[PDB]
Design a protein around this ligand. Structure first.
Ligand code: HEC
Ligand code: HEC
Ligand code: HEC
Ligand SMILES: C[C@H](CCC(=O)O)[C@H]1CC[C@H]2[C@@H]3CC[C@@H]4C[C@H](O)CC[C@]4(C)[C@H]3C[C@H](O)[C@]12C
Length: 71
């Protein structure tokens, strides 16, 4: 499958899967979640444990605006 880009108004946010599969061998951090996770995602999740919060917790990955958001 292909990587996905989230169409944030302030700048596209790419999600590169290969880097994540490699750096987060605990797949259940994102996979086999209960229902609702597709509908549930948004800015609040993304800036929390959905994206940015994990980067902060794991001490690796982009945490600055212009590192995730790219026109
Ligand atoms: C969130 C940070 C994830 C982690 C950690 C892992 N996966 Fe993932 N996966 C995630 C998304 C959002 C997607 C769809 C978008 C995409 O970029 O592909 C996927 C997709 C997969 C797939 C299909 C990929 C393909 O190239 O066909 C597989 C087979 C998969 N994920 C498995 C997988 C495993 C085994 C992981 C742990 C080692 C793992 N993923 C981590 C989100 C996230
Ligand atoms: C943990 C459960 C994570 C979640 C959820 C998300 N990301 Fe992540 N990401 C994580 C780690 C540990 C790393 C480091 C990978 C490395 O090898 O450095 C990353 C990395 C990124 C990157 C940069 C990829 C690179 O080539 O260095 C990007 C652009 C990124 N992450 C974006 C991103 C987005 C948009 C997420 C939500 C949709 C997201 N990540 C979730 C760990 C985790
Ligand atoms: C990755 C780890 C991010 C960092 C660091 C920042 N943002 Fe973000 N943002 C991210 C994603 C994946 C999304 C989209 C959520 C979704 O609905 O799919 C967003 C969203 C926004 C938005 C809203 C955009 C819209 O609704 O169209 C804004 C205004 C925004 N982000 C701004 C922003 C700023 C100013 C940041 C630094 C302070 C910042 N983001 C960090 C991912 C990530
Ligand atoms: C469920 C995990 C981890 C965050 C959490 O614990 O909720 C999060 C991390 C990244 C999230 C995905 C980002 C790309 C997509 C954004 C869409 O708007 C909704 C579906 C997708 C596919 C999201 C589904 C799900 O919401 C994921 C995989």
């Amino acid at each position: 499958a292909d990587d996905i880009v989230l169409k944030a108004k302030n700048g596209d946010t790419k999600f590169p899967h290969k880097a994540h599969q490699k750096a987060v061998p605990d797949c259940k951090k994102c996979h086999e979640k209960g229902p609702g996770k597709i509908e549930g995602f948004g800015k609040e999740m993304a800036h929390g444990k959905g994206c940015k919060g994990c980067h902060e917790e794991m001490k690796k990955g982009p945490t600055k605006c212009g590192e995730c958001h790219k026109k």
